[PDB]
Amino acid sequence: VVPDTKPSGPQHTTKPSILGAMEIGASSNATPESTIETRYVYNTNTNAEADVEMFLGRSALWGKVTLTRQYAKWEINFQEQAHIRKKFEFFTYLRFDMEVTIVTNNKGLMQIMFVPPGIDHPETHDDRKWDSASNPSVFFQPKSGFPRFTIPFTGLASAYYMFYDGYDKPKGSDNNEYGIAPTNDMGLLCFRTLDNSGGNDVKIYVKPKHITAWVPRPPRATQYTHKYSTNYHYKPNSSGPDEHVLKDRHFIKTRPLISSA
Amino acid sequence: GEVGKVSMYYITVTKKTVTERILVLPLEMSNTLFATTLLGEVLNYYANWSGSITITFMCVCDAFSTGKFLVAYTPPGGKLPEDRKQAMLGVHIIWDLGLQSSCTIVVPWISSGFYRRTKADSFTHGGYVSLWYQTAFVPPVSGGTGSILATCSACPDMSVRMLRDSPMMEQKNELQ
C-alpha cells in the first residue's frame, strides 16, 4: 500500500526540505508534510494495478492475418500494433513468456503450425511441409473453443531487445541491419483451414507473463512509421509533388496563451 | 510557435514594475502539459489517480540575477486567481533565488472524493498552479532575462487505478 500521511505542525526550520537541486539529477523527496499542515490520514490505496506484471499482462492484440486460400502466415512480433508496441517501448530489455490466443471467425477445422526459427514453413495450404514430425502444431475447431498455448522465453540472451543500438555484420559489410531485427526471431505461425466453412479473419492475442522489465525509457511520443525501425518522420503523400514533405505526428497540443490556461 | 522546438520547455521572465501572472498550469493529467511528461504519460493509462504532485521550478539565469516568485495552487472549485492577492490565499510557497535555483511546490491532495478522474471534468477538477512575481526578477543589467523551467513528479502516496488505453498514442496508418 501507499504510506499514510503524517501530521505536521507549524515548522520554523533552518534546513529547507523544499529548496532542492534539479541539476544533481535526483528527484525531490518533498511530501506534503514539508510544505503545509497535514493531518494523519489512514491511506490504503495500492499501486497494484501499476506493477509491470499487471500493467503489461493483459493479452493485447499483436497481429491480424487473412486466410487467402485457406492459408495465412504471421511472423511473431509486437511491432505492428502501435498501442502495445508503445507499452513495450517503455522499457529497454524485457523477459517474458507469452501466451498466444487465436480469435478466428472461421468455422471448420483449422491448424496452426508454430515454425521454430531456421526451417522452411509451408508456403501454401495442402503443402507437403504441413505433415511435420517435430514442428509443434495446434488443431482446433473454432466453434467451441479458442486455441491457446504458451511459448516460453526463447531469447538467445537474458532478455528481449526492445531497442538495439547495433548492427549484426562488421563495418565494411553491405546489408547491415540496424535495430533489433536480427537480434531475435520468435518463429512464425502458419494458419490453414481444412474445411471451407467460415471467414478469413484471424486475430492473435498475446499475453506477456512472468515479465521482468529492465531499463525504463521515455515513452514513445510520436506515431510510428515502420516496424523494427523507430523512425517517426511520416511521409504522407508519396504520389503527389510533395513526397519530400515529412509530417511529424506528435501529440503535443498547443494552448493560445500561457498564464491563461 | 514553440511546439516542436526545445524552446517550449522554458519561459522568459524579466524585471517588471508590477506583479504579473507568469504561468498557469491547470492540474489536469490530460492536459498537454502533464500528459506528455513521465508523470502524465504513466497516469494517462489509468482512469483515476489520487495523490500528491511535486512541481520543481528552476530558474536558469546568471549568477548575479536574483528574484522571488510566489507559486500558488488554487484548490479545486476555486476560480483562476488573476490577482496575487487572490492567488496567495490557497496553498502557496515563496522561493528566493540564490546559490540554489530549484524550488518545489508539493501540490497536496485536496479533494472531496477519494480518486480524481484523469480526463479532467468539472466535477473532479484539480485546480490551477499559478506562478507570480513575488517581488520582481532583478537581473544585473537593464534588459536582462531569466528562463524558468518546471518538472513534475509524484509523491510516494500517489496511486492510480482502472488501467485503460492511453489517449497519448494513435495508429492511423498500417505499420509496414
Binding site: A26, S27, T150, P152 | -
Partner: peptide, 25 residues
C-alpha cells in the same frame, strides 16, 4: 495454488524506487 500443467512456464500471472529518483553516490 495448483499448477495443472506440471510446468513453470504454464503458470498464471506472477507477482525500491531509489534506483531512479536518487542515483547518487
Amino acid at each position: 495454488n495448483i499448477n495443472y500443467y506440471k510446468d513453470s512456464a504454464s503458470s498464471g500471472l506472477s507477482r525500491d524506487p531509489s534506483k531512479f529518483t536518487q542515483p547518487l553516490v
